[model samples]
Target: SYDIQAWKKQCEELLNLIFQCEDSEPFRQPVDLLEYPDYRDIIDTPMDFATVRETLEAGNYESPMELCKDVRLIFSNSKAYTPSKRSRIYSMSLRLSAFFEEHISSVLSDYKSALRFHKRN
Candidate 1:
């Protein structure tokens, strides 16, 4: 049902005219990772989200696209965190409130789970 190529085409079409920098495949992308048993500390979770939020709160990134670039740079070292797949990330950051809402739900859920565990200890 979903056409990834078409989606990228649309993203590239719009972003090309707006920022006028790089091609579609060269853009950054956000990836979803899970915390597993073997390598939980380093490669478990997606720390890029934290980096992105911290940088955004730092007041340096003026625009969503700029924030997107900064976020990609933060995770450039990670094997799974590739910059070429971050079109949706840029778009999500552009919608600040919506981005916050979605992230907040996950953050809060994590926090709550932590609290629940600690309380049973």
Candidate 2:
């Protein structure tokens, strides 16, 4: 837990990291044009950036945990897609899946570390 003073510095550093994540490109739209939200509300119905962005606005995710949850859902919402027919999407999904697993995992670990970091200083 952070004391009041630590936050000034902690926030500065974390904010920088947050900015990078935001400004950087998201996992490049795998599984394009998903039939997102079609009878799949309240479930992990793999969705496209367009549709996910449509409902879960930037402001809605008040915490990193929320964002990560959304990201995982979107990434995992895999369709039983025919790799031969939709190789582009299938391939992209595979790429995004790997990236998010590593990238998102790293970011989350850092975020969790930040929570206990101030106590050590």
Candidate 3:
């Protein structure tokens, strides 16, 4: 496992990539209640990039794994809230979610490799 500071720095980099992605626009902020009154009713848990970033900044996550959970929630909520899989919102969520997963998986693989090397040394 990585120390908190190193994990946090990696998390921040991942967030930066997500933020830069154009598909992340709709997820940048909380869903407006006025714009989507049924959002809260339909989505059991509402999450967004802003909220996740705020939580990370606040040092609320106990471990690096928890950070990924909240980020995934944002996309899960979007996928559930959208009317259909064919919807643009659904596709956007899928894209960003896959993007996050791919990058994080590679990052984690590196971490594991580094840990093994450290142990061997």
Candidate 4:
């Protein structure tokens, strides 16, 4: 197995990158009232943006992840809603979420590769 510390560092780096990438101007304009955490937290819940933001800001990662998964599933199931509902702002959130998921996957892959390489040496 790879070192936990190294893996954590990799994860944190990727997380920061994801945060910075999502906080850009394009993503900021439409949802000027909402933060990334706010959108991420409320995507699944029926609550309005304000509620979502408050809930997310106060909630733990598990809660946020649950909400995010729920929202993504909603989007996936509602095929017809994708194009229309995912406006520029929504699209930015989706892209950021997808990018974060991909980055984490990449980090895991890198860890596995490092482990394999070490074993081979």
Candidate 5:
């Protein structure tokens, strides 16, 4: 079986990539409710990169799937809060989501293959 520490490291690596992205700056910290009082009303489940990183470091994630879901929530919340498709946040969400999917699928695939290979051994 694949080691959990390896999984954690993989998740960290993915998070670091996101942290380095300029588009991710808006999402690095928790949304400012004072700036946007309606954010909570619109987004039922708020998610941010810093929060996810803390969860990761705290060993709260049981699997890559769970972590990925939380990661995707950041973008989902952005789109949900921004009403217009023409909005910058909406487009940024789309771009980051695409970037995440592109890398995550590969990471998941590699994990799956490792599992399969180990199973036969």
Candidate 6:
């Protein structure tokens, strides 16, 4: 049993938090105060989603694929943010977001292809 819904919800919440921080007045400052957990720790680490339909339906392939997709979407959305005013904090955030986006996209795409192959088999 895995909870895909919960995982999605958490991912969305985290993304929203990132956006909210970006939109806040604190973000206007020149210093970078935002400290996200390591991208590798957040994205590369395995999640345990107990008791969820999507996870059950995922079998061996879909669960990881879905997780990968979620991570990719999170990073993708983060990278899409365009701050109106430029600042040191904004630049750092943008760089970090871009790095996460590129790395996670590569990982997610690989997982997606693997899942597709698994289904075809």
Per-model root-mean-square deviation over C-alphas:
17.0, 7.3, 3.0, 8.4, 2.1, 13.2
Candidate ranking (lDDT, best to worst): 5, 3, 2, 4, 6, 1
Better of 4 and 5 by TM-score: 5
In candidate 5 the C-alpha lDDT for residue 32 amounts to 95
Q: What is the TM-score of each candidate against the true structure?
A: 0.24, 0.47, 0.84, 0.39, 0.87, 0.35
Candidate 5 per-residue lDDT, tens place, 15-94, comes to: 89988888888899999999999888888888999999999899888777888999888988887788798998778778
Cα lDDT of all candidates, in order?
A: 0.40, 0.47, 0.83, 0.45, 0.83, 0.41
Superposed by TM-score, candidate 1 places the C-alpha of residue 58 at a distance from the truth, in angstroms, of 3.1
Ranking by TM-score: 5, 3, 2, 4, 6, 1
Deviation in Å, model 2, residue 101 alpha carbon: 2.3
lDDT of 4 by residue, 46-76 (tens): 3222332333445432323443443344334
Which digits, one per residue and each the tens of the lDDT, describe model 1 over residues 15-104?
334334232222234343342333334444443444454555565544444544543443343434334445553444434423334433
lDDT of 6 by residue, 1-121 (tens): 2233333444334444544553333332222225543433334332222212234344433444455554344334333442333655446556545644554454445555655666775
Candidate 5 worst ten-residue window by lDDT: 1-10
Better of 1 and 3 by lDDT: 3
Among residues 3 or more apart in sequence or in different chains, the pairs in candidate 2 whose N, CA or C atoms overlap within 3 Å are: 46-77
TM-score of 6: 0.35
For candidate 2, the lDDT comes to 0.47
Better of 1 and 5 by TM-score: 5
Residue-by-residue lDDT tens digits, candidate 3, 1-121: 5332466778888899999999999999999999899888899888999998899999898656788888888987887788888998889899898899987875566566656666775
